[PDB]
Amino acid sequence: ITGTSTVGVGRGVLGDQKNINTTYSTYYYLQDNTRGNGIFTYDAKYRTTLPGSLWADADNQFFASYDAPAVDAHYYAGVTYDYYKNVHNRLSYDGNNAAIRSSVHYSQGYNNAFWNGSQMVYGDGDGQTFIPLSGGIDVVAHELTHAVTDYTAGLIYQNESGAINEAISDIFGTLVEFYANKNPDWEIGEDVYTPGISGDSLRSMSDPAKYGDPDHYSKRYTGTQDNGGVHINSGIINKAAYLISQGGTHYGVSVVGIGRDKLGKIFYRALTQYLTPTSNFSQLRAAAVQSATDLYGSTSQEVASVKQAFDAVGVK
Ligand SMILES: [Ca+2]
Ligand SMILES: [Ca+2]
Ligand SMILES: [Ca+2]
Ligand SMILES: [Ca+2]
Ligand SMILES: [Zn+2]
Numbered sequence: 001i002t003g004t005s006t007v008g009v010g011r012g013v014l015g016d017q018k019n020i021n022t023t024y025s026t027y028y029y030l031q032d033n034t035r036g037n038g039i040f041t042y043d044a045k046y047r048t049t050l051p052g053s054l055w056a057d058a059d060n061q062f063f064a065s066y067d068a069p070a071v072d073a074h075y076y077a078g079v080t081y082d083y084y085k086n087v088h089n090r091l092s093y094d095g096n097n098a099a100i101r102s103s104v105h106y107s108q109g110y111n112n113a114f115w116n117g118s119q120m121v122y123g124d125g126d127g128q129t130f131i132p133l134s135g136g137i138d139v140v141a142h143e144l145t146h147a148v149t150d151y152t153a154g155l156i157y158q159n160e161s162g163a164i165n166e167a168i169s170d171i172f173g174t175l176v177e178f179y180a181n182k183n184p185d186w187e188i189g190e191d192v193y194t195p196g197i198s199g200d201s202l203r204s205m206s207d208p209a210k211y212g213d214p215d216h217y218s219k220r221y222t223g224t225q226d227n228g229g230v231h232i233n234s235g236i237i238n239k240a241a242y243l244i245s246q247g248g249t250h251y252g253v254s255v256v257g258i259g260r261d262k263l264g265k266i267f268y269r270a271l272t273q274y275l276t277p278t279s280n281f282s283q284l285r286a287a288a289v290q291s292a293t294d295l296y297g298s299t300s301q302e303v304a305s306v307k308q309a310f311d312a313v314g315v316k
Contacts, residue, residue, distance in 0.1 A: 001023060001025050001029060001031065001054065002025060003023040003024050003025030003029070003031075004023065004024045004025070005021065005022075005023055005024075005033045005034065006021075006022055006023070006024050006028070006060065007019050007020070007021060007022065008020050008021075008022040008028055008057070008060035008061065008062060009060070009061060009062070010061065010062025010063055010067055010068075010071040011062070011063050011067075011068060011071065012068055012071050012072040012075065012135060013068045013069060013071075013072050013131060013132045013134065013135025013192070014135055014191065018071065018075055020032070020062070020071060020074050020075050020078075021033070021034050021035075021039075021074075021078065022057075022060060024060070027056040027057060027058060028056070028057045028058070028059070028060040029054050029055060029056050029057075030042075030054070030055035030057075030070055030074045031054065032074065032078055035078055035081045035082075035092075035100075036081065036091055036092045036097030036098070036099070036100070037092070037097045037098060037099040038099045038100070039074060039077045039078055039081065039099070039100045039101075039102075040054060040099060040100070040101045040102070041054075041055050041070050041073050041074040041077070041101075041102050041103075041104065042054055042055060042101065042102065042103040042104070043055050043070065043103070043104065043105055044103040044104065044105050044106040044107075044121070045105055046105055046106075046107065046108050047106075047107070048106065048107050050103055050106075050116065050119065050121065051101055051103045051119055052103050052105075055070050055074075066105075068132060068135070069104040069105060069122060069124060069132035069133075069134045069135070070104050070105075070134075072132070072134040072135050072140070073102040073104050073120070073122055073134035073140065074102070076134065076137050076140035076141070077100050077102055077120070077140060077144065079137065079141075079176065079179070079180050080137075080140060080141045080144045080176050081100060081144075082179075083141070083175070083176045083179045083180075084148070087179070087264065088264075088268050090148070093144060093147035093148045093150075093151055094147075094151045095151065100120075100144070101118070101119040101120070102119060102120040102121070102122065102134070103119060103120070103121050103122070104122045104124075104132070104134055105122075105124055106121045106122060106123050106124075107123055108124075109123075109124065109125070109126040109127075110123025110124060110125070110126075111123060111125050111126055111129045111130045112133070113133040113134070113139055113140075113142075113143055114143065114146075115143050115144070115146040115147050115150075117150070120140070120143045120144065120147075122134040125192065127195070128194070128195075128196070129193070129194060130192050130193060130194075131192050131195050132192065133192055135191055135192045136189050136190070136191040136192040136193075137173075137176060137177050137180055137182050137191070138170075138173040138174055138176070138177045138188055138189060138190075138191075139173070139189055139191075139192060140173075141169075141172060141173040141174075141175075141176035141177065142169040142170060142172075142173035142188070143169070145168060145169040145172040145173060146165070146169050148172075148271075149165055149168055149169070149271065152271055152272045152275075153168075153271050153272070153275035153276060153277065153279065154276070154277040155168070155275065155277060155279065156277050156278060157227055157230060158227045158228050158230070159227070159228035159229075159230075159280075160228075160233070160279075160280040160281050161277065161278055161279055161280065162227050162228060162230035163228075163229065163230050163232075163233035163234045163236070163237065163281075164234075164237060164275070164279060164280075164281070164284050165230065166230045166231055166234035167234040167236075167237035167238050167241065168267065168271060170188055170203065170205060170234060170238050171205075171237075171238065171241045171263075171264075171267055172264070172267075172268075173188065174186060174188070174205060175260060175263070175264050178260055186204065186205040186206040186242055186246075187201035187203070187204050187205070187206070188201055188202050188203040188204070188205065189201050189202035189203070190202075203231075203234075203235070203238070204238075205238040205239065205241065205242045206239075206242050206246075207239075208235030208236075208238055208239050209235075213232055213233075213234070213235030214232065214233060214235050214236050215235055215236065215239045215250070215313065216236065216239075216250075216251060216313050216314045217236055217281065217313055217314030217315050218314055219236075220233050220236060221233055236281070236313050236314075236315065237281070237284065237313075239312075239313050240309045240310055240312070240313045240315065241263060241267070241309075243255040243257070243308075243309040243312055243313075244257070244258060244262075244263050244266070244305055244306055244309045245257055245258065245259055245260050245262075245263040247305075250312040250313065251312060251313075251314075253308060253311050253312035254308065255305055255308040255309050255312055256301060256304070256305050256308070257305070258301065258302050258305050262296075262302055265291075265295060266288055266291045266292050266295065266302070266306065267288065267291075269291035269294065269295065270284070270287040270288050270290075270291040273287075273291070274286075274287035274290060274291065275287050281315045282315060282316060284315075285306075285310040285315050285316070288306050288310070289303060289306050289307060292305075292306045
């Protein structure tokens with residue numbers, strides 16, 4: 001809507017207070033005009049019809065329990081936009097400042113979040129397995145990254161290309177978590193997963209096997225469930241990414257870590273310049289090696305580390 005840009009205040013899912021960009025026109029709306037063509041957050045009102053209604057508030061104060069998921073979806077979409085713009089010089093998910101839209105309170109007791117090809121959608125969780133999904137910055141960044149992938153490499157969501165698609169979302173979801181410096185780690189979804197259990201997460205990049213996911217190509221899932229195991233085999237790539245950044249010895253192969261910034265630069269270049277819709281793991285390795293070569297030279301430590309990491313997880 002057309003109005004006056006202002007700043008409101010509210011509390012997120014985890015009870016933390018934060019300032020959010022809003023727009024005033026009779027009501028205060030969750031519309032951030034400071035980033036690209038805008039960030040819009042909608043209320044799905046427990047229904048499945050999208051996008052729902054643009055979030056309207058009477059006093060620009062969002063401290064009600066019902067407001068929490070909206071506050072975080074709105075705020076974290078902004079942080080993710082900032083990451084891509086400041087670190088990779090990318091304007092929104094399409095590279096041309098496309099408006100970012102999110103709907104919260106989708107369905108009832110919905111333990112999922114997703115990108116539907118046009119916008120992000122967040123369930124409130126059932127209170128046991130998950131609490132409102134927008135409360136996790138790595139979750140929000142994971143979802144917005146699916147949009148970035150769709151506009152760039154276009155990795156088909158099935159088998160190996162789908163596992164790469166998933167890993168890319170976990171990798172950048174984690175890099176955004178570090179960017180925001182919000183209790184960063186190499187775990188996925190820890191802030192909104194199982195509120196009654198501390199110390200766990202949905203997936204682990206540092207040790208995928210902790211939750212039963214493969215950490216080597218020889219242990220890859222070859223079945224038909226989960227679109228060919230896109231959320232399972234992503235562990236193989238997540239482990240490789242973790243090794244490239246942090247280093248370590250995996251299955252007898254030693255990798256010298258080069259840091260998170262370089263990891264991000266290498267994978268962003270691979271994603272936007274070399275990957276295609278049908279790329280498999282072997283092609284991802286080639287794309288990563290070529291990207292590191294473009295940026296640091298063929299005889300660099302960076303290229304050596306990328307090769308070592310993929311060797312460690314069995315991807316040739
Ligand atoms: Ca209010
Ligand atoms: Ca964390
Ligand atoms: Ca995390
Ligand atoms: Ca937990
Ligand atoms: Zn995903």
